[PDB]
Design a protein around this ligand. Structure first.
Ligand SMILES: COc1ccc([C@]2(c3cccc(-c4cncnc4)c3)N=C(N)c3nc(C)sc32)cc1
Length: 376
C-alpha cells in the first residue's frame, strides 16, 4: 500500500464532495465514503434510503459489535440519527491495514444524503473534541494511528474537472511543485487556522484581522464553498463586483443561488479578480498567501440540459459560524494535515488551476510588524 497506489483514490461530483472507497465488516462490504476534514464521526448509511445505491448491513457482518448507544445529530442544514458500534474497517486504495473503528450506523436522515453523489457515508477526519455524541467517541484516524505504525499525518489533493488523492501517513512529492508552506493548527477540534490578511486583486480589504476569523476559521473538505463572516463577505462581494463591472449579474448570482452562463468556451475569466488569503506562518508575524482564481470560486455546474453553455454558481457565501476554506479553496492545492506537528501545509498541486495570464499560487514569506493577534 505505497503512496503511488494511493494516487487518484478520490472521485466526486462538483459541489457534492470527494469520496474514497472503504470497506466495513467481515466479509468486507464496499462503500464510497465522503472525506470530511470538518467533522469527526465515521457515519455510514445502514438502512435503505431513496438516494443510497447501497448501505452497511450489520447483520451480515460477523465482526460487528453494538455499543448500545444512540446518536442524534441535528445540524444547521439537515439531520441524521443512528446507533454506535465497532467493526473492521479498511481503505482498499489506502494504507495496507485493517483496524477496528467506531461506526455510527445511520438509521434515519433528512437532507444528509444527496441524489446521485455516489457516496454512502462520511469519514470525519477532524479531532475528538467535535465527535458526536461527545469526545469519548474516538475518531477513525485516531484509531488508525493507535492500532498501526501509520504516521500521524494525511494529505489531500482535491482536483476540479472530479478526482484527487488522499495520502495517508505521508507526503507524496509527485503531487506538488515548489515549496510547502505551513500554518499552525490553532486548536485541535476542527482544523482551525488563522487568516491574517485578505486581498482582492492585490487590494487589501483593510479590516482588523480578527474580522477574518470571527469566530473561527477552518479548513473543511466537507464544505463546498469559501464561506466568509458577514462583514468580510460583504467587502469581498463589493470588491469582486467592482473588478467585474464590465458585466452585470443578478443579485441571485451573488447570493450563490443562481447560475451565470456563457457560450461554451467563452467564460470571461479576466474580468474576475484573484483572491489572496494570507495565512499565519510558523513564526511571529510571518505569513504566506494562497491565491484563488475565478476558475476555483466560480464553480461549474454540470447539466446536460445547459451543455450548449458553460454555467457556474458563485462559490463564496456568507457564514454566521466563521470562515470556512472549503473544497473550492483546497482544489488545485496539495494540503498536508500534519497532526503530528499541529500544522497544515499548502503547496501548488499538479492539478492547480491556471490560464495564459494567471495561476493559483502559494507564496511567502510576508512580514507584518504592525500585527495584533488575529485570533478570536
Ligand atoms: C457528525 O455530523 C455531521 C457530519 C458532517 C456534516 C457535514 C456534511 C453532511 C452531509 C453532507 C455534506 C456535504 C454535502 N455536499 C458537499 N460536501 C459535503 C456535509 N460535513 C461538513 N463539513 C459540514 N458542514 C456543514 C455546515 S454540514 C456538514 C454534518 C454533520
Amino acid at each position: 500500500g505505497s503512496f503511488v497506489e494511493m494516487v487518484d483514490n478520490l472521485r466526486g461530483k462538483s459541489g457534492q464532495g470527494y469520496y474514497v472507497e472503504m470497506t466495513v465488516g467481515s466479509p468486507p462490504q464496499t462503500l464510497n465514503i465522503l472525506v470530511d476534514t470538518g467533522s469527526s464521526n465515521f457515519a455510514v448509511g445502514a438502512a435503505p434510503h431513496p438516494f443510497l445505491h447501497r448501505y452497511y448491513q450489520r447483520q451480515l457482518s460477523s465482526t460487528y459489535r453494538d455499543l448500545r448507544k444512540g446518536v442524534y445529530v441535528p445540524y444547521t442544514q439537515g439531520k441524521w440519527e443512528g446507533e454506535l458500534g465497532t467493526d473492521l474497517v479498511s481503505i482498499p486504495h489506502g494504507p495496507n491495514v485493517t483496524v477496528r473503528a467506531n461506526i455510527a450506523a445511520i438509521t434515519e436522515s433528512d437532507k444528509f444524503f444527496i441524489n446521485g453523489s455516489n457516496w454512502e457515508g462520511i469519514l470525519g477526519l477532524a479531532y475528538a473534541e467535535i465527535a458526536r455524541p461527545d469526545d469519548s467517541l474516538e475518531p477513525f484516524f485516531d484509531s488508525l494511528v493507535k492500532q498501526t505504525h501509520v504516521p500521524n499525518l494525511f494529505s489531500l489533493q482535491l482536483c476540479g474537472a472530479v478526482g484527487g488523492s488522499m495520502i495517508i501517513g505521508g507526503i507524496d512529492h509527485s503531487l506538488y511543485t515548489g515549496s510547502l508552506w505551513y500554518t499552525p493548527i490553532r486548536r485541535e477540534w476542527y482544523y482551525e487556522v488563522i487568516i491574517v490578511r485578505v486581498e482582492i486583486n492585490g487590494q487589501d480589504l483593510k479590516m482588523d484581522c480578527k474580522e477574518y476569523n470571527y469566530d473561527k476559521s477552518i479548513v473543511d473538505s466537507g464544505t463546498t464553498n469559501l464561506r466568509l463572516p458577514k462583514k468580510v463577505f460583504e467587502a469581498a462581494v463589493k470588491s469582486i463586483k467592482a473588478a467585474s463591472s464590465t458585466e452585470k449579474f443578478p443579485d441571485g448570482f451573488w447570493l450563490g443561488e443562481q447560475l451565470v452562463c456563457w457560450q461554451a468556451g467563452t467564460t470571461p475569466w479576466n474580468i474576475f479578480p484573484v483572491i489572496s488569503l494570507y495565512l499565519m506562518g510558523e513564526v511571529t508575524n510571518q505569513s504566506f498567501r494562497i491565491t484563488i482564481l475565478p476558475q476555483q470560486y466560480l464553480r461549474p455546474v454540470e447539466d446536460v440540459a445547459t451543455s450548449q453553455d458553460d454555467c457556474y454558481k458563485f462559490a463564496i457565501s456568507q457564514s454566521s459560524t466563521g470562515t470556512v476554506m472549503g473544497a473550492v479553496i483546497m482544489e488545485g492545492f496539495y494540503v498536508v494535515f500534519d497532526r503530528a506537528r499541529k500544522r497544515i501545509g499548502f503547496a501548488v498541486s499538479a492539478c492547480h488551476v491556471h490560464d495564459e495570464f494567471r495561476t493559483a499560487a502559494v507564496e511567502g514569506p510576508f512580514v507584518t510588524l504592525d500585527m495584533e493577534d488575529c485570533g478570536y
